Amino acid sequence: REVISIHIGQAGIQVGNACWELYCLEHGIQPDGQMPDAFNTFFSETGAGKHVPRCIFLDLEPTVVDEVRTGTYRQLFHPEQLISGKEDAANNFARGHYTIGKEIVDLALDRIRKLADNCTGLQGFLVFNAVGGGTGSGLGSLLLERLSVDYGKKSKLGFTVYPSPQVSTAVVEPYNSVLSTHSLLEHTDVAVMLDNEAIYDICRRSLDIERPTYTNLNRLIAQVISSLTASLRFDGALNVDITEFQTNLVPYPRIHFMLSSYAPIISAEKAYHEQLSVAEITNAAFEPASMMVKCDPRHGKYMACCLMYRGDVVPKDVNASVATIKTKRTIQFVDWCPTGFKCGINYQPPTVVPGGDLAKVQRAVCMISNSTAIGEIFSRLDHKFDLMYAKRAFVHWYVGEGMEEGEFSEAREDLAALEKDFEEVGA
Amino acid sequence: HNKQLRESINNLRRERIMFESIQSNLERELAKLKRDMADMIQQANGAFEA
Amino acid sequence: VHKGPNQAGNKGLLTYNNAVGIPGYTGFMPSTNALALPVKGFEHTGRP
Amino acid sequence: KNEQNELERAFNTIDSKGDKKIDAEELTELFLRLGHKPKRGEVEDMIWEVDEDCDGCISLLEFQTLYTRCRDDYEPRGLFNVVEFVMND
Amino acid sequence: LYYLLGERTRREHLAMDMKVRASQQLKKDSADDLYTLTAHFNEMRAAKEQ
Amino acid sequence: MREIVHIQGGQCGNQIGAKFWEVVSDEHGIDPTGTYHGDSDLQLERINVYFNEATGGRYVPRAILMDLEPGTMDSVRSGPYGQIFRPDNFVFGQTGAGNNWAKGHYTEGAELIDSVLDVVRKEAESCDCLQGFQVCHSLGGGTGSGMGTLLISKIREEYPDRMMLTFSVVPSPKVSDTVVEPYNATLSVHQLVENADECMVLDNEALYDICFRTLKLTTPTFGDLNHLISAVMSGITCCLRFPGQLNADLRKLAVNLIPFPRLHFFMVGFTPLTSRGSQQYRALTVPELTQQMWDAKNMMCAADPRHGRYLTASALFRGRMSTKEVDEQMLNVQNKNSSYFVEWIPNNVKSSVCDIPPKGLKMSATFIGNSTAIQEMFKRVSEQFTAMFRRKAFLHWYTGEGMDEMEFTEAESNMNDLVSEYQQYQ
Amino acid sequence: MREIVHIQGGQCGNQIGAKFWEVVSDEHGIDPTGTYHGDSDLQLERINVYFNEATGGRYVPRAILMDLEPGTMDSVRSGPYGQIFRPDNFVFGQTGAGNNWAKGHYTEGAELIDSVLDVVRKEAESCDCLQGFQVCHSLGGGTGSGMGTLLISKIREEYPDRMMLTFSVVPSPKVSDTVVEPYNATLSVHQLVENADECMVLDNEALYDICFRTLKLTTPTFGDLNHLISAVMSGITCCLRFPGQLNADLRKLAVNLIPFPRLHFFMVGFTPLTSRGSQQYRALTVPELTQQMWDAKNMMCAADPRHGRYLTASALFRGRMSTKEVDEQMLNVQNKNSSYFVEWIPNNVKSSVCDIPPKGLKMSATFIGNSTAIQEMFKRVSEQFTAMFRRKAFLHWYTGEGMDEMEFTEAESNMNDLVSEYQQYQ
Ligand SMILES: Nc1nc2c(ncn2[C@@H]2O[C@H](COP(=O)(O)OP(=O)(O)OP(=O)(O)O)[C@@H](O)[C@H]2O)c(=O)[nH]1
Ligand SMILES: Nc1nc2c(ncn2[C@@H]2O[C@H](COP(=O)(O)OP(=O)(O)O)[C@@H](O)[C@H]2O)c(=O)[nH]1
Ligand SMILES: Nc1nc2c(ncn2[C@@H]2O[C@H](COP(=O)(O)OP(=O)(O)O)[C@@H](O)[C@H]2O)c(=O)[nH]1
Ligand SMILES: [Mg+2]
């Protein structure tokens, strides 16, 4: 049972730069790459006293990639994986999908080919990218397209980073986001949205760090992913693999967008503070003050929820907890499903990273649900997309690259169809 | 500041929506239960007369 | 009637106690001075 | 009720498609009939502060509770004052 | 004006919440009375059988 | 002589069977290395029902583990009494179904079921006279329900004359693991009512409630729940493995408890079950066991039997007892609560006595009741099935694999006619 | 054979019962670990009245502890002879009523009485031929008075033909611990006049006076008072457990003492009670016992009988005594002070002899007199009840909980006709 992880764009490989640091520490691998069977799902044992990740960083600008090449993880991250282009897509979906994709995607998927042939029990792929940028959106969609036509039946777990409504670093993010979803809809099987402003508020409120950088963000992103694959990496009382989300969380072939959350995101002094048990973290996983997307789940009705439990938990109290949640009436469910839960329990507690701001906790919960607040998110992005598109702003860059208005309009009405789909299902 | 207050009000109203919906569902279930109550009364009367 | 839940005093085969009583005693006897049941007519399970 | 028959007749004459829904755009044509030019962002606010249960659209029940509330006594009377004008004339 | 509107809508929302809580209490009452009535009907069934 | 092979499916089935083979080996006195170390001779004559002598006192169980994910098999070999199975009996897939009944019944079955059929065949003709088959599995999971269900169908087609026991847990909304519980349970039950001879229904909700109230445990892990189910399974099969003053075989219990070919869903209890703090303060008499046995809060289903009637009932006792006391206790229970029994069948209680108690106890019992309160469970499930199916949720992960819609309507109709005929005979 | 189920309610009842079971176990020679260590066979043949053997000489009391604050349970388990009760009989709430009769009768009763009824139902069906029940409780508190009252009412409506003893301490103005003493006593007495067959009025005032004058104790804690009350209760039921020249069971004593269905409030005493300093200067004869029995200062109630008349009286003697001496003494004490006895009833004294003295005495006695002076105690309480009820002090705590005012009017009216008919027969 093995799963490979590809990273697209500037944000994706920074996430991976934190993720694999967490992985090698969790499996006791020094950054040079050797230990002083559970690792087999991420690391292949070459020769003697060496392990190499099942991953490929890829990006168009060489700055961030060769910073990985020269950093502390020279020996661990292997030479061929780190694919780097010569020049950026420059926040231009057309430039990252039609000009430079045509030269880089074949080299990438030919690497993925020999990676899958090295693997034996491939569970699925999982991609890391942000759709606001050019490289993450454009060749990310192009790659996912060629991965779908090549394998198709294998699960594809897409952990995307959407632009925040009020916090924004770029300008053409609406154009690139919409053009990303136009392919993300019919290519990814299981796609999890993670905003930035929510993580800012989480680090501000619970972690009480006044001045956070991207490092702490990516640190807790790795915590979430590691807590999601812990069921495969280690045995538990009730294990749940990568194919179960495919079944238990996606009621329709076009409704796959999952809100994720994590608990307890706590500081060092506050672990000393509070008495921790299952009931309060099961609660705190449902407040919007602890979700990974800046959206209000009270505005929406849940479709299905999944609960990853790590550490020292029995099935008794977690079953009692979800009982209290199901009988609470602050939050409601759809009338379509009576049993809207999918639990999972693993024995190994979450590990800590030196320099990280989380305390070592006895037990933690990773929630992944499905709601209609996402349907509100896409409308919020759609509104500011049409505001800019109405004046034909910035269109000449994409047209000069070689695209037209047809895919603009059809992606616009494609999101409109997605809006209608959500409004119909939520009823 | 006006926009902040407006957003807060909008949130409050959108939660009021959820509250009235769950109220409606609970009322449906309560009506079904009182129907069951009346049925049990009728069954008891029948057994007593028998 | 005589057999009841939760009391292990008077569960012996004989109604009375042979140790300190005559039949029709209706006095309490402990479980220690109470007879044991016969399982079957032949007493062993072996094939030499 | 003797005011309320004409209230609901005023409501459907303000409406054009005849349904429960009235949009700010129909409100713009009503403003054109009144004669004074509304602001750029005024008519959305006027509909938003009164539309309470549903969203975007305004409903007959919403109009009704708004009317009896604004009949009573520091309260937004945005759309109330203008319909009252229709009631007066 | 918007401040006062918020002050009003908060009270209305709290009223809705308390109505929901009362509905839950009535749910519990109705469930208990249903259980007792079913028990009574089973008793009457035993009586008429005897 | 009379032979019972064991078939374990899915994760729950494997962990239940692990505890089951631990307690059976404990009863027959064989150590976890596979050799005999008992004291009494009574254990030797009836190990041929559950074992095969290999070489020099090496008794391997007549078991077949079957699933699709190596985690469960590793957890089997990890714990004690895992070194005694035959590695060839570890018939085993590689992909994994994962809560998808269509995966467990149409795609992965086509390449696993021929192999499991090979090994279960070879293990069937390895012995002389089959009594029947014994399958432990779930109705919520994918690799347990679907694969085990097709296995039942294939087996009942090849050996239609042998008995068959199915210990199947059912899901409940109060202890709910997954989301597709009704889509799995409805289809499996739909197939079990035409294939299986009888089913012993279990559920985790009643077990948790038992360990809370009667056992008064603090942390009811899965180990103790599987421990209770194992004690139940040893209790129902003790008649063949040991002599007694009145012997009741499997077919004997079936013909005593099954009045109609579709009325074969049993609810089970177990006695004695006492808390450790009160373990020495209690007494051991047949009335004491009977009071705990006929209690409604001791059933291992989420079906209050006082909301219906017992069609029939059975109690298998273990220990030195007087059958006169046994029969008068059954008569007292039938005479006092005469409303809770059916009218048109007199003497609704079958009994049996075996003279060997379980290890550590002086006297135990095992209750098996075919009541009509089970229709509450199936209505409770079928209504969730209709709630999801009426708006076609989650339907496409099944229709996209080979299943069609009329199968779901078939399971609906079969579930509905079953519960209606239960309501009829009530 | 004849059976007595013991029920303890409230803090007063539980601690009294704790010393009670200590004394009883001492008399039957069973050590606090629950095994037999006596010497004669006379102790064995009548422990089915009070105990049930669990397994191998482990005798457990037939008692039910019932309260709402775990501190009493802790104080029970902490002391010796604490590990003998069955943990299942520790039926027990969690909130606490706290001197609120409505809390003990309407709020917590509704969810605690069902469970305690199931426990006492199992304890009563565990025995064959009920003689009656024995309920120790208080009248001042809430969880003892109101709860025990509801339990008595439920039991009387279920087992109407069985006897019932209740030992109730009553409040006094001189020993006045709580403040709603009249509000609790009046309602409880109003219910004990209709439900309970007979009760024994006790009070802490007379007990303190006894420990000061006769015992000449320095620090009369609650342990010694409960020791006295325990000795009296043991003296009452000595007749069922040990044979004598003249048996007098509970029902036999009831019919000998109760002339009219409402005249069942008895003042009780106990002899001998002498200080260890003066036990050397005393003798041990039946006159020596009797002239301490009929002493006014030896009654365990604050109702001096020389303010009224005796209706009936009983004496239970224990030890190898001469029945002529017994009867000539009852005749002499009836002829000397003839005015204090009722006129239209000849031979107002029932007597009885048992041949087994308590451990530590050669010859003992127990006086149970049904006088008419108890109208003084009820008058003393009813006037405090009216004094508060005249302008509704403390009333909202009860009326706001479900009770109404006409219950109080009913209670005082029943108290008033009770006292007036005692005065009538005087
Ligand atoms: N959470 C998080 N987001 C990041 C991080 N780095 C970049 N981003 C997001 O990435 C978006 C812009 O895209 P980039 O990742 O900078 O670069 P790109 O996606 O490859 O697109 P190009 O700049 O054209 O190459 C910004 O809106 C950021 O929000 C990071 O370390 N953590
Ligand atoms: N009693 C018991 N039940 C279990 C155990 N493991 C899982 N279950 C139940 O089985 C259901 C899930 O079945 P699963 O093991 O996933 O079936 P599978 O995926 O087909 O192998 C859950 O509802 C659990 O309640 C166990 O060890 N003991
Ligand atoms: N003899 C005796 N009386 C007690 C003891 N504890 C409390 N009391 C009496 O009980 C009365 C108060 O009633 P209480 O015990 O609180 O009743 P409850 O609250 O219902 O349990 C006081 O007047 C005390 O005199 C005790 O240990 N021995
Ligand atoms: Mg970039």
CA of A32 to the centre of ligand 4 (A): 28
Q: Decide: residue F67, CB within 10 A, 0-12 exposed, 13-18 middle, 19+ buried.
A: buried
The answer, for B50 touching chain A at a CB cutoff of 8 Å, is no
A34 is an annotated ligand-binding site residue: no
- In sequence order, the 6+-apart residues with CB closer than 8 A to the CB of F395 are F389, F405, F408
Torsions phi, psi of G307, nearest 5?
-95, 0
Determine which residue's CA is closest to atom 13 belonging to ligand 2. Answer: F141
Q: Whose CA is nearest to atom 24 of ligand 2?
A: F177
Q: Which residues of F touch G55 (CB under 8 A)?
A: 280, 282-284
**Which residue has the CA at smallest separation from atom 15 of ligand 2?**
F11
CA G221 from chain centre, in angstroms, equals: 19
Distance CA F377, CA F171 (A): 9
Among all residues of A, which ones are annotated catalytic? 244
Cα separation, G26 vs G32, in Å, equals: 9
- What phi and psi, each to the nearest 5 degrees, are found at residue F395? -70, -30
Nearest to G11 by CA among G197, G189, G222, G196: G222
**Closest C-alpha to ligand 2, atom 10:** F12
Question: Measuring CA to CA, which residue among D74, D78, D55 is closest to residue D66?
Answer: D78
D56-75 residues touching B, CB cutoff 8 A = none
Answer whether B12 touches D (CB < 8 Å). no
3-class secondary-structure state, position A283 = helix
The residue count of chain C comes to: 48
CB proximity C45 to G under 8 Å? no
First-to-last alpha carbon distance for chain E, in angstroms, is 74
Crossing angle of helices D78-88 and D60-71, in 10° steps, is 90
β-bridge partners, A13: none
Q: CA of F139: how far to CAs of A297, F21, F148, F178, in Å? A: 32, 22, 10, 11
Q: Which atom of ligand 2 is found nearest the CA of F229?
A: 1
Pairwise CA distance, residues F232 & F269, whole Å: 8
Residues A89-120: b if buried by 16+ CB within 10 A, e if exposed: bebbbbbbbbebbeebbeebbebbeebbeebe
E12 vs chain F: nearest CA distance in angstroms?
A: 34
- Answer whether A224's CB lies under 8 Å from A324's CB: no
Q: How far is CA A167 from CA A22, A289, A378, in A?
A: 28, 17, 16
Radius of gyration of chain C (CA): 14
Suggest the residue from A153, A255, A339 to mutate for an interface test with chain F (most F CBs closer than 10 A). A339
Q: Which regions of A65-186 does DSSP assign to beta strands (E)?
A: 83-84, 122-130, 155-161
State the DSSP string of G259-322.
SSTT--EEEE--B----TTTTTS----HHHHHHHHT-GGG-SSS--GGGS-EEEEEEEEESS--
The tokens of A263 are what? 């608990």
Cα–Cα dist A319/F205, whole Å: 10
The kind and range of the H/E element at G369 are: strand G364-371
Cβ–Cβ below 8 Å for F281 and G86: yes
Burial of G397 (0-12, 13-18, 19+ CB in 10 A): middle
Compare CB distances from E49 to F306, F307, F339 and report the shortest one's residue: F339
Please identify which residue in the block is written with the tokens 């967490």: A22
Using CB distances shorter than 6 Å, the residues near ligand 1 are A 9-11, 14, 60-61, 88-91, 130, 132-136, 161, 163, 169-170, 196, 214, 217-218
Site of tokens 């895992």: F82
Q: Tokens 């005024």 — which residue?
A: D42
Distances, alpha carbon F112 to alpha carbons F88, F95, F143, in Å: 14, 11, 11
N residues, chain A: 427
Atom in ligand 2 nearest the alpha carbon of residue F98: 19
**What residues of G are in the C interface, CB distance below 8 Å?**
1, 36, 41, 44-48, 52-57, 122-123, 125-128
Q: Is G13 in the pocket of ligand 3 (CB under 6 A)?
A: no
Spacing of C-alpha G407 from chain mean position: 26
E–F contact: 3+ Cβ pairs < 8 A: yes
**Contact assessment for residue F29 and residue F36, using Cβ atoms and an 8 Å cutoff:** yes
Ligand 1 atom nearest residue A91's Cα = 24
Report the candidate in A54, A33, A16 with the shortest Cα–Cα distance to residue A136: A16
Experimental method: cryo-EM
CA-CA-CA-CA torsion sign (G373, G379, G384, G389): positive
Element (H, E) at G160: none
Min Cα–Cα distance to chain D from E13, Å: 12
Q: Give residues after which chain D gaps, C-N over 2.5 angstroms.
A: 73
Collapsing DSSP to helix, strand or coil, A184 comes out as helix
Min Cα separation F288/chain G (Å) = 9
Contact (Cβ atoms closer than 8 angstroms) between residue A60 and residue A100: yes
Give CA–CA dist F251/F401, Å, rounded.
38
Nearest CA to ligand 3 atom 22: G177
User: Are residues A219 and A353 in contact, defined by beta-carbon separation less than 8 angstroms?
Assistant: yes
- Residue whose Cα lies nearest atom 7 of ligand 3: it is G12
**In this complex, does chain G touch chain E, defined as having at least 3 beta-carbon pairs under 8 Å apart?**
no
Q: Terminus-to-terminus CA distance in chain A, angstroms?
A: 39
**Is the CB of F93 within 6 Å of ligand 2?**
no
For residues A382 and A413, give the distance between their C-alpha atoms in angstroms, rounded to a whole number: 10
Q: DSSP 3-state assignment of F3?
A: strand
F276 touches chain G (CB under 8 A): no
Q: Is G12 in the pocket of ligand 3 (CB under 6 A)?
A: yes
* CA dihedral for A68, A69, A75, A78, sign (positive or negative): positive
Is A10 among the annotated ligand-binding positions? yes
The amino acid present at F111, given as its one-letter code, is E
Choose the residue to mutate in G68, G78, G112, G138 for probing ligand 3, maximizing ligand atoms within 8 Å of C-beta. G138
Alpha helices in F29-169 (DSSP H): 70-78, 101-102, 109-124, 145-158
Nearest atom in ligand 3 to G202's CA: 1
| Distance to chain G for F292, nearest Cα, Å | 11
User: Do residues A235 and A340 make contact, with C-beta atoms less than 8 angstroms apart?
Assistant: no
For strands G198-202 and G265-268, give the pairing: parallel
Strand, helix or coil for residue G346 = coil
For residue G353, list its beta bridge partners: G246, G317
> What is the experimental resolution, given in Å to one decimal place?
3.4
Rg of the Cα trace of chain A? 21
CA of A183 to the centre of ligand 3 (A): 79
Rounded to whole angstroms, the Cα distance separating F123 from F125 reads 6
Quick check: CB of G204 below 6 Å from ligand 3?
Answer: yes
Report the 10 Å Cβ neighbour count for F126.
Answer: 11
Whole-angstrom distance, CA of residue D35 vs CA of residue A290: 52
Contact residues on chain B for D52, CB-CB shorter than 8 A: 13
Q: What angle do CA F134, F139, F143 make, to 5 degrees?
A: 80
Distance G177 CA to ligand 3 centre (A): 9
CA distance C48 to chain G (A): 37
**G142 pocket-lining for ligand 3 (C-beta < 6 Å):** yes
Burial of residue A213 (number of CB atoms within 10 Å: 0-12, 13-18, 19+): exposed
Residues 6+ apart with CB under 8 A from F25: F31, F32, F61, F81, F84
Would an 8 Å CB–CB cutoff place F179 in contact with chain A?
yes
Query: Of A234, A259, A261, A239, which Cα lies nearest the Cα of A249?
Result: A259
For residue G413, the CA-to-ligand 3 centroid distance in Å is 27
Per the structure block, which two tokens stand in for A48?
A: 């003697």
Residues of G with CB below 8 A from F275's CB?
A: 87
G212: its two tokens = 């000061």
Contacts of residue A392, Cβ cutoff 8 Å, sequence gap at least 6: none
Complete DSSP assignment for F317-364 = EESS--HHHHHHHHHHHHHHTGGGB-SSSS--EEEEEES-PPTT-S-E
